[PDB]
Write a protein that binds this ligand. Sequence first.
Ligand SMILES: Nc1ncnc2c1ncn2[C@@H]1O[C@H](COP(=O)(O)OP(=O)(O)NP(=O)(O)O)[C@@H](O)[C@H]1O
Ligand SMILES: Nc1ncnc2c1ncn2[C@@H]1O[C@H](COP(=O)(O)OP(=O)(O)NP(=O)(O)O)[C@@H](O)[C@H]1O
Ligand SMILES: [Mg+2]
Ligand SMILES: [Mg+2]
Lengths: 215, 212, 510
Amino acid sequence: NHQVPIEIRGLTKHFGSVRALDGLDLTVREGEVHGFLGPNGAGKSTTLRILLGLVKADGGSVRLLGGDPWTDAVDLHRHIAYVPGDVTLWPSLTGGETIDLLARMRGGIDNARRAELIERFGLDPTKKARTYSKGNRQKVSLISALSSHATLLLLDEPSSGLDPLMENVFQQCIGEARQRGVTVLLSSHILAETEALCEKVTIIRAGKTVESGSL
Amino acid sequence: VPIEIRGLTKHFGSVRALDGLDLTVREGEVHGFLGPNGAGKSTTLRILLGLVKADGGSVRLLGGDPWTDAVDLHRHIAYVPGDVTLWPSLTGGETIDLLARMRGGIDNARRAELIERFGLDPTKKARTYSKGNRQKVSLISALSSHATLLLLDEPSSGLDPLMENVFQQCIGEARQRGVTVLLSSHILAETEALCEKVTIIRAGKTVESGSL
Amino acid sequence: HRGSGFTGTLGLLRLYLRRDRVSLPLWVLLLSVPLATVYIASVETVYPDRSARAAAAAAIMASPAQRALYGPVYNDSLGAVGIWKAGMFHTLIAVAVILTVIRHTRADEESGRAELIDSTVVGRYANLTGALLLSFGASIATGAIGALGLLATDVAPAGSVAFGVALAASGMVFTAVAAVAAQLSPSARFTRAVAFAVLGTAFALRAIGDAGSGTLSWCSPLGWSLQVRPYAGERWWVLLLSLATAAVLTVLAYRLRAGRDVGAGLIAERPGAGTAGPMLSEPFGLAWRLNRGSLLLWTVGLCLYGLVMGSVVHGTGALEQAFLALAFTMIGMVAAAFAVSLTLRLHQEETGLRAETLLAGAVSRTHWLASHLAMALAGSAVATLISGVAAGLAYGMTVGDVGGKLPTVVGTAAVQLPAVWLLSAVTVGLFGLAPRFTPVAWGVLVGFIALYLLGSLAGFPQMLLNLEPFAHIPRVGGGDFTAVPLLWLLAIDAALITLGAMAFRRRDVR
Ligand SMILES: Nc1ncnc2c1ncn2[C@@H]1O[C@H](COP(=O)(O)OP(=O)(O)NP(=O)(O)O)[C@@H](O)[C@H]1O
Ligand SMILES: Nc1ncnc2c1ncn2[C@@H]1O[C@H](COP(=O)(O)OP(=O)(O)NP(=O)(O)O)[C@@H](O)[C@H]1O
Ligand SMILES: [Mg+2]
Ligand SMILES: [Mg+2]
């Protein structure tokens, strides 16, 4: 993968008359937590939908893990874990069943980490998924993504709805994931977890890159 | 005393969602409402709107019961949910106009001011809004009404720092003209700036309460 | 001041009214206009001399099979014989009103609109009252239009009013049922299944009563409409029954509402399992887990219907053939609706933001699609074959042998599959080219059903009735079997499916 998990050059996409992206650039470099900052309407989620192959790009080059995101979106997706901006679960499945189900279509779950993640996020894994408050509904995705085989994490506002302590447990989990050579791309609006976790911030404004570099 | 919860209690199945609560908000002040992810903060705000029907205790919202007097009280009250869902077909301006028609009143001189200040584009289908402009619809539809009591569950979620600053200034201006606010945050940085007299509940009961 | 629980009813009613403004007029006209322009208009051509009409009546009262589907004929007047065939319109209106009430009450309330609406100055009962007013208005308008159309013909004018009022009451009785069912569960599909189980039971009781003495047809809201007896001596007081059952139930639908909370039902929820089993590790396992109850309920219902229809076939093999081939077409239509819903599981999955969660993994777009497609193609086939087997066993026992009557009835059920799968193919083709317009497969199916019912009866040319699959199905038994149209109906299906698949891999999941 040329030791560069992500490499975007001149990305472009229009949604009709709306120019969502107009020349975005990125480069994540095998081992670092990368901050993906920008205003509302910048094009942060859309980029995360282009790396996953859900959406096709009108121009430029994208090289995810050394391959094409659009045509190779099955063998590259078993090295990747994804946390969406809007977390939606199946209302009939249990909380502990969704973790196992989601982690099984990726590279696979790790039962040593799963138990200690459920232990310290304080989740109740025997409870239907339509009774989770906005905060135990995010712990399901966080535990499912942080206990899996993944050499790249694409987190999209992963601490939305977490009280000051469950979002300090998450920082420790990310810090100890970075120790074993895991690459993280972190999109967020809280510039208090970005300072503590991330170096190499990257700020985009209207689909274009306006700032980049180490903190 | 707009809110005088004195002993609330709620069971859903065998789950003790609320086990004796003592919230008390007074006139013309911003009140914080904090707690971990099991406390019962979103349930309490649903009990005050007459949507959950608490199993015990006393609730005197604006001097009347929330369950049997809901329609009469809800013309002084605005609500911003933690999970904002709109109509995908309608437009942002159309949604605000429709919600103003149901509430039976709006302030257009403030509606225009908020629309041109939050940066909302009021001519776009609501299904194209990027989770930060979806919260602006609720914020504008609630801050531009005639309500004298606002209940905000998580008003600034998905908002970049500039828009969160704008929201803070808007809440300050609202508090200037004698408006009462009850705010659930999980963000102890806007709670410290906006409001005094926080209230913390851990397992469905109040643990501490008082001036900051 | 001046507030009650019914505030906001008119506003909610009008924003329900404008939501379905291309659907409500269409079916309101479809269930009322073709009563004087088709059924009564095409009785002076088929049955001219009155001496002939009487003969037709003597051929209905001497066959329980024909009067199980439609009901008895009590005299040889032009109106009675002409409108005998239109006794099926008392079930379609019930289906329509049930769907409308559930759609506007519980489907929205499951999408979070209840919180947004009720946080305003909108009463507690406004949402219920708006849907009830809409359904009552629709069911009264269809009856009024039908009566006005029938009053312009040369039939007796009293029976026309009686039929119109009976048609209105049949749809007013099954609106309270839909409301009471909607007050029950937090899931919309469970409420729809509960509402339709009552209608199925009522139809089965009505059929068993009609095909026999007639005592058992007094225990069902359907069959309270045929005993009004338009054109054959009107019993007016029977409508009072349909006015009490609607009033008693609709009060309950309010008493069940003044004690639930927005979002819940009547029974709290139970804990599940904290670990997934060895079956829920795949899109195939996930799709199976979501459709177990629907598959079981549809299978049981179709088996019971086949068991009921097979007993009346023999209370001369040139009439049991014609009745079995006519009775299994209805089963084919019901299984087609089953397939359409099991495939719309896919549109509901994507529009709920849960498709991007699955597709952001080592799942392909064709392996995900062919996990709901494989359930729609298999559940309908299993249900249809089980219904055919049950009908064959029931028919064989009442005749004397089973091994000579089972294979033919199984073949009759199995030759309906190419027409059933065509609607799954249409839904898959629509989901992949125009995903937003996926739910017009319902309109396509209703158009096919309407064409089949009102085709060779209003004089359409036999090149316009060829645009539907239910007319091309062969006839098993004796000769007349070709097996060519099936080969033309399978191929089409494959093509459509392929098209949809090829149009899904090159698209945006946005
Ligand atoms: N389906 C769509 N059709 C049209 N415009 C769209 C669509 N999806 C997104 N957009 C627009 O594309 C732009 C980029 O939005 P988006 O990619 O969601 O950025 P964003 O960073 O996620 N917003 P936010 O999450 O608040 O920071 C916005 O102007 C959207 O309104
Ligand atoms: N409909 C329901 N059925 C059963 N249990 C429920 C239901 N709604 C909420 N609960 C439970 O009741 C408790 C209170 O939830 P809730 O008040 O929503 O949390 P919260 O105060 O909002 N904290 P947060 O997750 O940050 O929003 C939790 O244990 C929920 O799981
Ligand atoms: Mg976003
Ligand atoms: Mg909450």
